Write an enzyme that holds these catalytic residues in place. Structure first.
Site, PDB file in Angstrom:
ATOM      1  N   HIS A  58       0.839  -1.197   0.000  1.00  0.00           N
ATOM      2  CA  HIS A  58       0.000   0.000   0.000  1.00  0.00           C
ATOM      3  C   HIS A  58       0.874   1.247   0.000  1.00  0.00           C
ATOM      4  O   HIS A  58       1.122   1.842   1.047  1.00  0.00           O
ATOM      5  CB  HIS A  58      -0.914   0.009   1.228  1.00  0.00           C
ATOM      6  CG  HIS A  58      -2.097   0.920   1.096  1.00  0.00           C
ATOM      7  ND1 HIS A  58      -3.392   0.452   1.067  1.00  0.00           N
ATOM      8  CD2 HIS A  58      -2.181   2.268   0.980  1.00  0.00           C
ATOM      9  CE1 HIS A  58      -4.225   1.471   0.940  1.00  0.00           C
ATOM     10  NE2 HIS A  58      -3.515   2.583   0.885  1.00  0.00           N
ATOM     11  N   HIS A 108       1.687   4.983  -2.237  1.00  0.00           N
ATOM     12  CA  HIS A 108       1.304   5.949  -3.264  1.00  0.00           C
ATOM     13  C   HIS A 108       2.590   6.323  -3.994  1.00  0.00           C
ATOM     14  O   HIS A 108       3.153   7.404  -3.803  1.00  0.00           O
ATOM     15  CB  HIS A 108       0.659   7.166  -2.612  1.00  0.00           C
ATOM     16  CG  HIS A 108      -0.628   6.850  -1.918  1.00  0.00           C
ATOM     17  ND1 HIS A 108      -1.849   6.910  -2.555  1.00  0.00           N
ATOM     18  CD2 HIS A 108      -0.878   6.393  -0.667  1.00  0.00           C
ATOM     19  CE1 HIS A 108      -2.796   6.501  -1.728  1.00  0.00           C
ATOM     20  NE2 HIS A 108      -2.233   6.180  -0.578  1.00  0.00           N
ATOM     21  N   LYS A 136      -8.401  -1.171  -6.525  1.00  0.00           N
ATOM     22  CA  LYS A 136      -8.592  -0.517  -5.240  1.00  0.00           C
ATOM     23  C   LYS A 136      -9.853   0.329  -5.312  1.00  0.00           C
ATOM     24  O   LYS A 136     -10.307   0.689  -6.398  1.00  0.00           O
ATOM     25  CB  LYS A 136      -7.363   0.344  -4.910  1.00  0.00           C
ATOM     26  CG  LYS A 136      -7.612   1.838  -4.676  1.00  0.00           C
ATOM     27  CD  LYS A 136      -8.202   2.137  -3.304  1.00  0.00           C
ATOM     28  CE  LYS A 136      -7.173   2.045  -2.162  1.00  0.00           C
ATOM     29  NZ  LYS A 136      -6.346   3.238  -2.015  1.00  0.00           N
ATOM     30  N   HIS A 183     -10.223   0.658   0.823  1.00  0.00           N
ATOM     31  CA  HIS A 183      -9.775   1.690   1.747  1.00  0.00           C
ATOM     32  C   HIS A 183     -10.959   1.857   2.684  1.00  0.00           C
ATOM     33  O   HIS A 183     -12.061   2.181   2.234  1.00  0.00           O
ATOM     34  CB  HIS A 183      -9.531   3.026   1.037  1.00  0.00           C
ATOM     35  CG  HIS A 183      -9.512   4.203   1.966  1.00  0.00           C
ATOM     36  ND1 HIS A 183      -8.393   4.574   2.680  1.00  0.00           N
ATOM     37  CD2 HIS A 183     -10.497   5.050   2.347  1.00  0.00           C
ATOM     38  CE1 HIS A 183      -8.689   5.597   3.462  1.00  0.00           C
ATOM     39  NE2 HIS A 183      -9.961   5.905   3.280  1.00  0.00           N
ATOM     40  N   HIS A 222      -6.432  -0.362   6.455  1.00  0.00           N
ATOM     41  CA  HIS A 222      -6.594   0.727   7.415  1.00  0.00           C
ATOM     42  C   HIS A 222      -7.593   0.269   8.484  1.00  0.00           C
ATOM     43  O   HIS A 222      -8.234   1.090   9.128  1.00  0.00           O
ATOM     44  CB  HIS A 222      -7.142   1.993   6.737  1.00  0.00           C
ATOM     45  CG  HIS A 222      -6.313   2.478   5.589  1.00  0.00           C
ATOM     46  ND1 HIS A 222      -4.959   2.707   5.693  1.00  0.00           N
ATOM     47  CD2 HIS A 222      -6.649   2.780   4.312  1.00  0.00           C
ATOM     48  CE1 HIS A 222      -4.496   3.126   4.529  1.00  0.00           C
ATOM     49  NE2 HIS A 222      -5.500   3.179   3.673  1.00  0.00           N
ATOM     50  N   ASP A 239       1.166   2.735   3.592  1.00  0.00           N
ATOM     51  CA  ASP A 239       0.366   3.820   3.041  1.00  0.00           C
ATOM     52  C   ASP A 239       1.373   4.951   2.870  1.00  0.00           C
ATOM     53  O   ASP A 239       1.071   6.128   3.082  1.00  0.00           O
ATOM     54  CB  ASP A 239      -0.756   4.237   3.992  1.00  0.00           C
ATOM     55  CG  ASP A 239      -1.786   5.124   3.313  1.00  0.00           C
ATOM     56  OD1 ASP A 239      -1.881   5.072   2.067  1.00  0.00           O
ATOM     57  OD2 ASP A 239      -2.510   5.859   4.015  1.00  0.00           O
TER      58      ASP A 239
HETATM   59 ZN   LIG Z   1      -6.541   4.481   2.058  1.00  0.00          ZN
HETATM   60 ZN   LIG Z   2      -3.637   4.887   0.598  1.00  0.00          ZN
END
Ligand SMILES: [Zn+2]
Ligand SMILES: [Zn+2]
Length: 373
Positions: A68, A70, A162, A201, A230, A285
């Protein structure tokens, strides 16, 4: 003298191996970025032109798999000035991450899957292993080929999709849109040899995981393809996640969330609840700006503050992730697998990092960096 340097023979000897399974003091022989032998006392001259590394007194384990991240940057929830930068190779490697899965978040207007695809490939050329998820928080998914199913089936680095649910930034997807999306990733995965997962998410809505159960009630996507992430963001949601994992699902705890349920705490609670570590994963994340230091910190805390063995503490970041995403050749030190290895001190401080047999980190500092770092 005949030249055998093309094989990149590297012998890591004398380290206490956790593959993640405790293998005691054991050597690992590497060739062409692949582990070709795992045994006690491998002759230092078994292969020619072999770089022998003395790891006596150190620990050797699988490189971390962060599913996870970005990769091209994220944020943007408070205007364009909050759009975070792309991830730097050295940041991943120095944190022990050798495999990564990139994804998009709230913003899929100024962020695009084609950009994510490109970054994922740059990271692969640069030395590590990277995959991505198509789509983003928004549903129906904004894809590369116009279809979630086709994206997972034909874009080699795409392994799933996602989305966001029970979150104030969701696109308010109903069960049909959610089920169809998940089913398309599943079928696309079968066709392209991808795990075909759907990562959710999770937000703070009181409905929590209900959309996922509604989805299971309206389609036949195996529960093993549905990954809520999460889950430690709020207690009610975390409790539901444990219940979900108990029913056969796998849950993703985020290491960048320290409250109300810290990452190490969430992993411990999962075990307390009787959940096999195989169904518990940990992601950062990262760059969502979130760093990757929380990954190793979680392992350290699990062993130091909680009473997890090094072997178990490693599972949520290695074999468990590799198992969930069917990442062949990753998360385990065995012959035939990729030479993604971490060299640590007994105190679990990273010293060296190898990705596909290449030395990425030497003294805790990256010695291989992104083209423009
Ligand atoms: Zn998220
Ligand atoms: Zn994320």
């Amino acid at each position: 003298m005949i030249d055998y340097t093309a094989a990149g023979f590297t012998l890591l000897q004398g380290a206490h191996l956790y593959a993640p399974e405790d293998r005691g003091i054991c050597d690992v022989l590497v060739a062409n970025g692949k582990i070709i032998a795992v045994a006690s006392n491998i002759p230092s001259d078994i292969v020619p032109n072999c770089t022998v590394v003395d790891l006596s007194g150190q620990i050797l384990c699988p490189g971390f798999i962060d599913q996870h991240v970005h990769l091209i940057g994220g944020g943007g929830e408070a205007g364009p000035t909050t759009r975070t930068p792309e991830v730097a190779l050295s940041r991943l490697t120095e944190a022990g991450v050798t495999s990564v899965v990139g994804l998009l978040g709230t913003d899929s207007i100024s962020r695009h899957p084609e950009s994510l695809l490109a970054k994922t490939r740059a990271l692969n050329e640069e030395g590590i292993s990277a995959w991505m998820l198509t789509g983003a928080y928004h549903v129906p998914s904004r894809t590369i080929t116009g279809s979630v199913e086709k994206d997972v089936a034909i874009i080699d680095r795409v392994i799933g999709v996602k989305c966001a649910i029970s979150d104030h930034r969701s696109a308010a997807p109903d069960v049909y849109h959610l089920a169809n999306m998940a089913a398309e990733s599943r079928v696309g995965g079968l066709l392209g040899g991808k795990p075909g997962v759907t990562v959710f998410h999770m937000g703070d809505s009181k409905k929590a995981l209900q959309p996922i159960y509604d989805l299971l009630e309206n389609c036949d996507v195996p529960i093993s393809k549905l990954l809520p992430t999460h889950v430690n963001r709020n207690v009610p949601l975390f409790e539901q996640a444990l219940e979900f994992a108990r029913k056969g699902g796998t849950i993703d705890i985020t290491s960048s969330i320290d409250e109300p349920v810290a990452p190490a705490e969430g992993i411990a609670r999962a075990v307390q609840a009787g959940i096999p570590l195989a169904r518990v994963t940990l992601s950062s994340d990262g760059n969502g700006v979130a760093g990757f230091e929380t990954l190793l910190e979680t392992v350290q805390v699990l062993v130091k503050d909680y009473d997890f063995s090094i072997s178990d503490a490693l599972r949520p970041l290695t074999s468990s992730v590799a198992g969930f995403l069917n990442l062949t050749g990753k998360g385990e030190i065995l012959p035939g697998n990729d030479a993604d290895l971490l060299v640590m001190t007994p105190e679990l401080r990273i010293e060296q990092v190898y990705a596909r047999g290449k030395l990425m980190v030497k003294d805790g500092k990256a010695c291989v960096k992104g083209t423009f770092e």
